Homo-oligomer: A and B are copies of this chain.
Amino acid sequence: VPNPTMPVKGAGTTLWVYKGSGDPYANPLSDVDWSRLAKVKDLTPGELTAESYDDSYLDDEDADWTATGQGQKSAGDTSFTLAWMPGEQGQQALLAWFNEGDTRAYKIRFPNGTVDVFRGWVSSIGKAVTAKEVITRTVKVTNVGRPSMAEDRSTVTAATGMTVTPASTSVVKGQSTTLTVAFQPEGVTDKSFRAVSADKTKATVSVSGMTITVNGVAAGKVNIPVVSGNGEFAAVAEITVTAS
């Protein structure tokens, strides 16, 4: 099961092109009105740029350090090479796209359920032929407008369903207690936590596997505060330890 939160291998990224008449950005997930550009040897998505714009004034009291601001953005250039199958549908449509020279929508589907949707017009159709190597039809499209990138269709949650399950028992020397950090705003959250003791002179704490380990090397009542966000929620676990 792909998770858009962990690094992904980079094989299985397919590439589609619109053929219908709607707005591709609305539901890029669905592949109903999208043709699949088959047998993609290699692709390289374009790089989103923005040239510099000066913000320097004669009256400005500085003149040694440049001041600049984001100029006008530009959505790069997407270049991909596929195997030459001239007579199969999906390549003749592409050649028509180039020779009639108009902008249509295309999308890149990573193996995450995250799809980068662009729109553009072909700027270069090529082909490289050598013996003993599959004839490559090469393509490059210049994008216009602004892609609705994958980060735009992600969602985040902070619905405050957080709790900490303690032990609060007389932890012995040579043994470690486990306290659990329940992290669910009904299923899905998007935040981390930091748990640290209140003494750091009698007992020690550690965080692993979302849970917190306490070693009471010395006795007394030891407090473990756990805080998340910038202080959205915190829990104080009280632990007792005797000399044993």
Chain A residues with CB under 8 Å of chain B are 3-11, 13, 20, 32-33, 39, 42-52, 62-76, 83-89, 91-92, 95, 98-103, 110, 112, 114, 116, 121-135, 138, 142, 144-146, 149-152, 154, 156, 190, 194-198, 200, 223, 225-227, 230-236
Contacts and interface: CB of A to CB of B under 8 A. Distances in A.
B10 A134 contact: yes
A100 B49 CA distance: 12
A9 B154 CA distance: 37
Contact of A144 (B9, B65, B138): B65
Contact of A73 (B8, B65, B236): B65
Nearest to A74: B66
Contacts of A9: 131-135
Copies of this polypeptide in the complex: 3
A236 B225 contact: yes
Give the top 8 A-B pairs by smallest Cβ distance, nearest first.
A4-B87, A70-B101, A47-B126, A225-B225, A5-B87, A196-B231, A66-B74, A7-B83
